[PDB]
């Protein structure tokens, strides 16, 4: 026996209205409501759709679970300074209130008139928390756009730390039409512990971040995909299709259980 309503009574629930937890951290037009909220269990609706620029996340499974298990959506505003470039590039596929907008937590760079010189900027972390930086690399659908946006045929993105380094040179190719845009973005992540530094260096094709996140690891936070909505009853246990409020330790309902719940 199970209830058809999710009840948060002691736990902390967040309704991901039109936003997957990954697009929620990027700052898509529909994901303004989620920003600035902690949670123990994030409900991810299967009706969540893409709204902004078409993109793809290598190792998407890791970034999804890491963002989930921390339970903190607070964003630290860190002022980056970019040299001899034009920032705040917007897109038409990413429409926010019918104004040509971009990711609320990201920054798109383009050359100004005649050049895109070598960028060299660092931010050493000495805080009492680990920092998560979310950045992307833009792939032009034509070689001609590669010189109009970034004034370089061999673009490059090299985001390094004290232990790792990831050098990516974008590949140019025509992708199928996704909201009238044949260009894709590859998003990567790099975690910086206290006493570690993060370096940014790009001769072209960078989706720069407007800051970083706060990381509280080894904390109880998880995610769940379901269509059942939230109710108003009292329970510490939630399953794949409802809440369970029984005392019998053996209940045959589901295998996905969160909390102090009776076994299979």
């Amino acid at each position, epitope marked *: 026996q199970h209830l058809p309503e999710l009840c948060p009574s002691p736990l902390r629930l967040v309704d991901g209205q039109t936003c997957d937890i990954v697009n929620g951290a990027l700052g898509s037009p529909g994901c303004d409501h989620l920003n600035g909220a902690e949670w123990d269990i994030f409900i991810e609706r299967p009706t969540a759709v893409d709204t902004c620029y078409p993109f793809d996340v290598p190792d998407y499974q890791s970034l999804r679970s890491i963002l989930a298990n921390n339970g903190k959506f607070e964003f630290i505003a860190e002022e980056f300074q970019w040299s001899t470039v*034009k920032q705040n590039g*917007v*897109s038409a596929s990413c429409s926010r209130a019918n104004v040509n907008d971009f990711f609320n937590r990201l920054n798109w760079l383009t050359g100004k*008139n005649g050049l895109y010189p070598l960028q060299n900027l660092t931010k050493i972390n000495n805080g009492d928390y680990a920092r998560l930086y979310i950045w992307g690399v833009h792939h*032009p659908p034509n070689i*001609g756009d590669q010189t109009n946006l970034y004034k370089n045929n061999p673009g490059r993105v090299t985001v390094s730390t004290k232990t790792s380094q990831t050098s990516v040179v974008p590949n140019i190719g025509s992708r199928p039409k996704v909201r009238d845009q*044949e260009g894709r973005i590859s998003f990567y992540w790099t975690i910086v512990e206290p006493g570690d530094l993060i370096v940014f260096n790009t001769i072209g094709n960078l989706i720069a971040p407007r800051g970083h996140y706060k990381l509280n690891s080894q904390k109880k936070s998880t995610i769940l995909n379901t269509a059942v909505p939230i109710g108003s009853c009292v329970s510490k246990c939630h399953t794949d299709r409802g809440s369970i409020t029984t005392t019998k330790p053996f209940q045959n309902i589901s295998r996905i259980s969160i909390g102090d719940c009776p076994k299979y």
Partner: antibody, heavy 133, light 108 residues
Framework: QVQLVQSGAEVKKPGASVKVSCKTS????????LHWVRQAPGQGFEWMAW????????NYAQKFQGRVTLSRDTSITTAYMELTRLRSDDTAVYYC??????????????????????????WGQGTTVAVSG | SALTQPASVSGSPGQSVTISCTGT?????????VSWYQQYPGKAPKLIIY???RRPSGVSDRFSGSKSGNTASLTISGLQAEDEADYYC????????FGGGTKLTVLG
């Protein structure tokens, strides 16, 4: 090779209306702004208004707000500039010029945040307009 | 919105000529990135330097501009040969501002 063609010289009696056409070639007409500026005999240049070829947005000067009116044609790149209620004062060589700033990239869907002025790199050959009663 | 220029500049061939540019209080001191032009008699003007110091494809290295506080200058250091023309200047002060214009005279 970039060139700007302007309509021929015209003479109007005061109080009439004038319409000048500028036809671009060799560049994407919708990827740049468009300016209109006049130069009086023995005088300097004086800017009037700009127009957005991709959206049709316009912004006039106070001296010409209510008389001038711009228009754009997506096919064949011809821009226009109609001035109503002209007077004997307005005797000048009217120029059409493209701004250097690129604002849109249609394949990659990119757009510039706002507009900044840097320079008018291409100018039309000029339309000599005479207004005498 | 003034962007005042000298009325004339006289110079001997082989030397350099400087044409300065000044406006009013904080009108030109606005992240200058100024532009310049060269207009021959009875001809359309051409853009010679944009962003104060950079040249486009075609202008020889003889044309140059520099930052001097509130003043912006232009130097023509080559053997002047056909530089006799009216030189104008333009910046942005709410609505793109134009200078009066300076005529260069080749010596004879």
């Amino acid at each position: 090779q970039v060139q700007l063609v302007q309509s021929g010289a015209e003479v109007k009696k005061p109080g009439a209306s004038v319409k000048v056409s500028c036809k671009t070639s060799g560049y994407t007409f919708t990827a740049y702004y468009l300016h209109w500026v006049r130069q009086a005999p023995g005088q300097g240049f004086e800017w009037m208004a700009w127009i957005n070829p991709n959206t049709g947005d316009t912004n006039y000067a106070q001296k010409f707000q209510g008389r001038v009116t711009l228009s754009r044609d997506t096919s064949i790149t011809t821009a226009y500039m109609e001035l109503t209620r002209l007077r004997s004062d307005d005797t000048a060589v009217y120029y059409c010029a493209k701004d250097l700033t690129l604002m849109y990239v249609f394949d990659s869907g990119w757009a510039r945040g706002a507009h900044d002025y840097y320079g008018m790199d291409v100018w039309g050959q000029g339309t000599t307009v005479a207004v005498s009663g | 919105s003034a962007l005042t220029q000298p009325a004339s500049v006289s110079g001997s061939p082989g030397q350099s000529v400087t044409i300065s540019c000044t406006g009013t209080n904080s009108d030109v001191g606005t992240f200058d990135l100024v532009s310049w032009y060269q207009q021959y008699p009875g001809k359309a003007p051409k853009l010679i330097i944009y962003e104060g110091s950079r040249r486009p494809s075609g202008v020889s290295d003889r044309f140059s501009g520099s930052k001097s506080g509130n003043t912006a200058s232009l130097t023509i250091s080559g053997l002047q040969a056909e530089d006799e023309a009216d030189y104008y200047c333009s910046s942005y002060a709410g609505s793109v501002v134009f200078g009066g214009g300076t005529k260069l005279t080749v010596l004879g």
